[PDB]
Structure 1
Amino acid sequence: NTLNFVRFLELGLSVACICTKFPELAYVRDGVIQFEVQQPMIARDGPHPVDQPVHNYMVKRIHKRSLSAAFAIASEALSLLSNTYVDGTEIDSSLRIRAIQQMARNLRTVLDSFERGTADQLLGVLLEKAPPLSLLSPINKFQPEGH
């Protein structure tokens, strides 16, 4: 069986995230992002207090996660690779090549797992982020402004 490799970008879910590399990520303590939003204002008369335009300043912070995958090597594979007990005959060269084929076929899937699992993490975080529709829709509708 030839497994098919999946690249995260080709997936339609990639449209929901802005990916970017950052080699020195393990040294980040509290990544901080900033917002500054102003709101409009209308003027009225009569027994209404005259209002002033407002500004808002919002600050969010980064949340850190991780991904891990495993990769196994049997003892005989190490023995064949280290050449510690080699006899220099054509019989063991085939065994060594079998071990290396196993290692490479294994490593390909191990590397593919990160690509395949970034989508999993994005689904997980989006689920943990989304409030239910049945609440969000009326809330965003039946209150004009708030307070």
Structure 2
Amino acid sequence: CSTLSLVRFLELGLSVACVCTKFPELSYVAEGTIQFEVQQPMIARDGPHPADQPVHNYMIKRLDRRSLNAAFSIAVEALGLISGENLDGTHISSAMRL
């Protein structure tokens, strides 16, 4: 029998690329934003060339959305055996349930 080697995203080196925050309410959330402000350092220089005023700017960035997905099934016989509905007083049945 082969066992699958499970991997955890936090242990990979790629984890340092992004920062992940668990957000248990994302289903209710329509578009979200983030706010940016930044002020450029200026330089005072001699002459008629404009030694201009400092510059501000306010950039906003919008949030995108995508979703993962995965599926699997369980047969009906297994459903009965697990539920405890079909088990009989036979050792042969407990083996199948296991």
TM normalised by structure 2 equals: 0.87
Deviations 1:62-95 (A, max 9, x none): 1111111111101211122233333221111111
Looking at structure 1, the residues matched to 11 and 83 of structure 2 have their Cα atoms a distance apart, in angstroms, of 40
Task: Find the structure with the greater CA-based Rg.
Answer: 2
Does the alignment pair 1:27 with 2:28?
yes
Asked if structure 1 preserves the Cα contact closer than 8 Å seen for 2:43 and 2:51, the reply is no
Number of residues of Structure 1 aligned to a counterpart in Structure 2: 97
Q: Provide the residue aligned with 1:117 in structure 2.
A: none
Match in the other structure for 2:42: 41
* 1:50 CA displacement: 4.1
Return 5+ residue gaps in structure 2 as ranges.
none
Aligned to 1:67, the other structure's residue is in SS state coil
Moved over 4 A (4+): none
Q: Which amino acid aligns with 1:6?
A: V
Identity percentage of aligned residues = 72
Report the secondary structure of 2:92's partner residue.
Answer: helix
Other structure's SS at 2:67 match: strand
* Cα offsets for 1:10-47 (capped at 9, x unmatched): 10000001111110111111111000000011223434
Measured after TM superposition, the shift of residue 2 of structure 1 is 1.4
Question: Helix, strand or coil for the counterpart of 1:43?
Answer: coil
Give the superposed CA RMSD: 1.5
